[PDB]
Symmetry: D2
Subunit: 476 residues, 4 copies
């Protein structure tokens, strides 16, 4: 298990090929746009060494201690252990960090346990898993093709190499060129270029699955407008430390070593990779724990805002808070059933229930916008009446302490709270979180169509046919 210092030193020494506003980022650990999230990930690693959480976040195996997200679960108890680690890490950042590495470790763990799925590339998968685990490396990923002409398939874009495709194969590996649309949290040592979870690969030229060091020559991470509001924790409680960053990933004829190839030119293998291996089940397990943590944070903030300005005495405000409670319980319920109904898949890997997780990941994208709306409706103008810590420290400080106090709440505490509520919903950072929840796991339109097609609807249809037998009997 890595310490924060080791993670920071690793990035400083071999930084990912990041670009920000036309220039290469030489040191993300000190760059104003990235130092915040780097410190945050480092803190997650350090927590693994805190005696209070060591048993929760890591496990011992043959003299070594590994991060819990690498544990191949053999029992429901192990599944619960993975869940508790997901939750503890998520709580550190109020569920605002959506791409912490344990999400992808769940994917790699499942791929490794179900390695036979990959055929001749099975050993590469097992070895890669052990590599990430032993060195406790941080990962980022990109599974989608550039949004250019969505009316056409990957092979029907303006250029055959807009999506990442194989240019040629050599004795050393494969050369790829193209791009992936989005990779969140590029402050990692490795990047996973895996298949889409719900979309079809289309052509063999694009049916790929491989991993590379983020410093690989020819690999570029083009960052979008930064959403770090500032460094003050009072003024920007969240964006100052949890801005993971999103970027376009470019492959300028990048060489991928054969040992890092997991799938090559096999459309079928790409299309069922997550479902067959159980990666889908485990990555969704991390998500349900994460969204439970996020919902708990919103509940706390909503309750405090309402109490803070005396709005909690109004029935409709109480109802809005109760609504968040209902959603919180719904997520806890999915989480519980996912673990309690777990069964082994075709490769003997115990996986959390897909029914419960499909329910959670398809329901939360609908609940989140409403949870966000509730905070807006409760806070109202208090959400934009945001003086700075500098205003409190300035000449008008005394006036602010009078006009911005709340009901039995000091002004500084009140503004600190509303600054947080604002950063969770209305700052550029907060607003992005909404778009993230709506789409990170896929386009809801196609996720729902996928659920329809894969779900076994026969038992329910059969019960109706049986019930209708009495109806048709009138003609006998």
């Amino acid at each position: 298990a890595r310490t924060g210092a080791e993670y920071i030193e690793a990035l400083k020494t071999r930084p990912p090929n990041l670009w920000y506003k036309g220039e290469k980022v030489e040191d993300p650990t000190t760059h104003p746009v990235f130092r915040g999230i780097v410190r945050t990930m480092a803190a997650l690693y350090d927590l693994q060494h805190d005696p209070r959480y060591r048993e929760v976040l890591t496990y011992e195996e043959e003299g070594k201690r590994h991060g819990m997200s690498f544990l191949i679960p053999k029992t429901k108890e192990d599944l619960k252990r993975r869940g508790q680690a997901y939750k503890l890490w998520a709580d550190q950042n109020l569920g605002m960090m959506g791409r912490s590495p344990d999400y992808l470790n769940a994917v790699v763990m499942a791929y490794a346990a179900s390695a036979d799925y990959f055929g001749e590339f099975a050993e590469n998968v097992r070895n890669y898993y052990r590599y990430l685990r032993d060195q406790d490396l941080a990962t980022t990923h990109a599974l989608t093709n550039p949004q250019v002409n969505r009316a056409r398939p990957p092979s029907g874009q303006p250029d055959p190499y807009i999506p990442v495709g194989v240019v040629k194969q050599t004795e050393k590996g494969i050369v790829v060129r193209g791009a992936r649309m989005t990779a969140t949290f590029p402050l990692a040592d490795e990047v996973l270029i895996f298949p889409s979870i719900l979309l079809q690969a289309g052509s063999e030229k694009y049916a790929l699955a491989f991993a590379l060091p983020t410093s690989t020559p020819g690999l570029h991470f083009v960052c979008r407008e930064a959403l770090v509001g500032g460094d003050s924790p009072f003024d920007h409680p969240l964006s100052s430390r949890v801005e993971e960053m999103d970027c376009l990933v470019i492959f300028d004829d990048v060489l991928v070593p054969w040992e890092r190839v997991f799938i090559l030119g096999n459309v079928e293998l790409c299309n069922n990779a997550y479902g067959a291996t159980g990666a889908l089940n485990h990555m969704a397990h991390q998500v349900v724990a994460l969204k439970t943590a996020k919902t708990e944070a919103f509940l706390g903030v909503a309750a405090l805002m309402a109490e803070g300005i005396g709005a909690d005495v109004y029935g409709h405000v109480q109802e809005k808070i109760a609504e968040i409670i209902v959603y919180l319980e719904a997520m806890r319920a999915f989480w519980t059933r996912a673990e309690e109904e777990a069964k082994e898949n075709a490769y003997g890997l115990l996986v959390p229930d897909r029914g419960a997780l499909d329910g959670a990941r398809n329901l939360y994208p609908r609940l989140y916008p409403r949870i966000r709306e509730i905070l807006e409706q409760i806070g109202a103008s208090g959400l934009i009446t945001l003086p700075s810590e500098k205003d409190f420290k300035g000449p008008l400080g005394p006036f602010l302490e009078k006009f911005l106090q709340g009901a039995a709440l000091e002004a500084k505490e009140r503004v600190a709270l509303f600054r947080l509520a604002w950063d969770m919903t209305l700052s550029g950072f907060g607003a992005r979180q909404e778009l993230y929840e709506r789409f990170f796991f896929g386009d809801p339109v196609r996720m729902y169509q996928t659920l329809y097609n894969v779900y076994n609807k026969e038992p329910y249809k059969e019960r109706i046919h049986a019930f209708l037998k009495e109806s048709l009997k009138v003609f006998e």
Copy 2:
């Protein structure tokens, strides 16, 4: 455990004091408006004797066999057994019977296990429980006051005795007069006049809890407009057999024997009766199983309708069906967590988790109208193109077999299906189901306000305060 014949004979011999359109109902077992539901309840009782389900629906105890809903659960396994019985009974009627007796048996069971709660009336409660259990009697209940002037409390209505109040107490018992607004499924041997689950009793004169035989002199059940569409199972697949009926309950100076009194003049005891005893937990347990069954029925019908007319090829139709699947999984999740997180209450009674059940009973009233809407959006005009079995048997039968066939579906089967979908949503019977789901457990406005007030929000608020410490540190 009762057989259907015993239930039917009991009603015929000592029928409840029912009134329909100005006249007393002499024999509900043969009356056109009630014979359907009577036969349905009888069938539920008979199922208890089917060898295939005997072990699911009943339990043996000291030479006797009792209905599962009377079982005082000692372990989570027992809780699961109660749940499986709720589900099996619910499935028989596609979850359309909302007031089957096992719901109230759950209440009485909990009251009995937590009998110490009732003080001097504890033995009356225990004895009543044993009575209902041993004779396997059917119950109905009414907990709300007449909807007259909702702007005023029970003691502020046009008359002190609009709500049920104590007139006087004698050596034989108490005399009560007033009325209860609604009692569903009056085809029972007993009626439970218990306190409101979420509303305050208000005055001692109304703080009551007692049970009476439905034939008690002075007790009247005034039925509303019947929703039985007819007797043909083809034309009215559900209303012909599952119309439970709703009625106003009148108490014309009714004498309640002391042995049938459970709470008298104690506002506090009335206000916490369901929560303290665990009745709330267990009755909600029956509800979650019931709504899971209901959602399964809608899923089957929606899937069959879409497939039947070839609408399943359209993405948005697939999405609507997937939406029902998400809701189904949500209910299954609440159900699972309710049992898995069960703990004993203050009286040593194991009760399913309130968090999960409060989530289920406060979420489903919001989901149901949408599930109903989905069926309407899928069926469209097919939902009102409802010829009768008589039309198929008539001269135009051949034409109907051509114009009303579906995609690889015969016309009679198609119409049988749409007649069912219509009866589940648009017939008077179907439409009532929507109002029922919206309100049976209470007014959502006050249920949400209640949830807000009773839920422990402190842990979430505390986490936010801890997170904000860094914000306030800028002033140090």
Copy 3:
């Protein structure tokens, strides 16, 4: 202009070929299922002769007086006159009659004014218009094909003649066979078999537009389950008089005289018939007035229910009523703009603004379910506590007058009101109204796709391009 007596005599003498539950309906004017709506339509005709409304409902022209819905408007004032007639008729039945004849007269009127559109069949159209106008006949229509396999076009169903198609052409006319899915209000002298408003005709064999007497040999109207709750106006205030009935229309090799043919084998003419002639504009004009009347009825009922039980003192109840007010004003606004922005089309016919009417007919289907929901949320259990007038007239009458009185409202008046609210929303009749509002003008999915394609979006796109010029200038 016809009188009610003339309409009733016409139906009695030459009744439409109606079938109900396997038998031919010999006299709809006395049949229990149809006498109610027949009396209602008759009353609409009689209103044309009431001196108070004669000038509103009819116009004089060359010694004759015709129904206002036949008036070819030359000015905005004439358009307003047509609107006021639509409204007055709609108000008589609280906007519950969705297929009153003035809706179709608007269609025929527009077809006649724009008759050149129909080419060689132009005179047939003009003559038909004059026929309907002079004799003030009642019409019904059916524009959709049987719902069999929606995954296939009209020419791809299990049989080439499931949809209405031309079998052959002779010296006397054309012979057609097939069926139309739905025709509401079959108590008419004529039936209009016109093209779909938003769907493509597909094949020439189905590209038809003609009209026939409802008694034409080979023509059959198969009625669905009747929704008449009874004859008591107290018990069934609406279903006893406004149940229009829906039916499947069968064509058993029906001969259509050449003079009654308006479009034959011309897919293009069918696909643009309503838009080019202005029929769409005028029929939607009747609809907006009708929905304004319907919304006014719901507002009145909601206000009275809330006041009646004292629920109007609660903020959320006030908000729900205000919501209906907002929707009412929205419809009034569309109506006003539709008339004020009216312009002449290609044939010189003044037509109300399509933008405003497309807004109204695409928005109301979304608002109605909510308006219905609001009534349910306000009334709660009062909506199913429906004793009969017979109960009030019976032995328990005195008790009911006490327990069902409202806040300063007598019990009989209270129940009369809730019986009405129930009939508007939860009776089989009421529930059907919801499905009707959702679909009568077409499937929302395709109506919205149609609006997208026909609307001129260029001006808005152009404004954005202009705004972005400054953005692209940074590269100069």
Copy 4:
């Protein structure tokens, strides 16, 4: 009529008492946080002198030319002229500037026309109007009290002077102390401290209405966190120029000259000021035109995004765009009816219809969040894949031109468009717009309660009573 140069010189010479992060803003015309919006307002003033729009934006009167928003309308044509000016100004900034001065000029104009309402202060009002008009000054306003303890009235806060209250009265005027919660667009010469539009004044000490120069000693404007993303029009198309800023307004014992007092200590006059004078009608008129402009901008962007990435070929995407079209038409309809149904009030001032405007201002806050959602659902990941103009100008420029091109759309144009869509919805600037639309005119909860109470519901209730006469007749 003012020119932009005159406005800029005025602010530079006598700048409002603005504070940003603890320091006084000496020159808002050059300050990085304010220079953008200052230039934008200046451009609005300059447009008044463009020959193409002079007749639209100004009117001549006795040798002088004034801004159209000052015109006291005598006819519906004048009302239309005011509307066209509101629209032209709104279009310049895609409806993103919510507090342009013409909104408040509408208020002052109405106050002046209905000056008799103010009694002894009537001349002060007339004179103030002429002052603002003649010098074409810019105004800002603040009507709400500090959000401290909403469970208590203005007189029940932690201090009697948290809300703005009169300390004393002298020969020169009144001295006030306290604060107003929010004032948007403080880059004005004058600030209007008027009564709340929907809330009660409460106590005479707070029942005030006056105006002051923004540089008045003791008056302070404390600005919130700035939302200007940068100066690049490519990177921040909107926040670089339309960030109006919100601020808390502090009154440190400010002296208000008697000539600037319009209402003093009269609760009744404060509570009906906007309705009686017609200010409510006219300010809402500006709003409906503004929201129509805003909706047109969103329609253009949504259409371009969908077309740009080829998503317009999908039915659901077309439906979402059509949804915006429906909302656009709804707003146009309210606007049209507001002008067409205009009538003179008690003071002879012609005012647009309140019914239509109450509909528009109570409906749009519900429509806007959905319009915003639609853009998010259409753009998906394209909304966060935002490289900078600097990235296009850098080494990877060529790669970006390939991977970020759209369907028949160049990469720079595509990113310029998505940068705009992002700034309209997800940037801190964009997200604030949502909160603004939800609350600027008041809390929806109380706006709806207000609408319920003031609307005349009697006609609808009367129609229902008349309809029910037939129901009650059964007892005769």
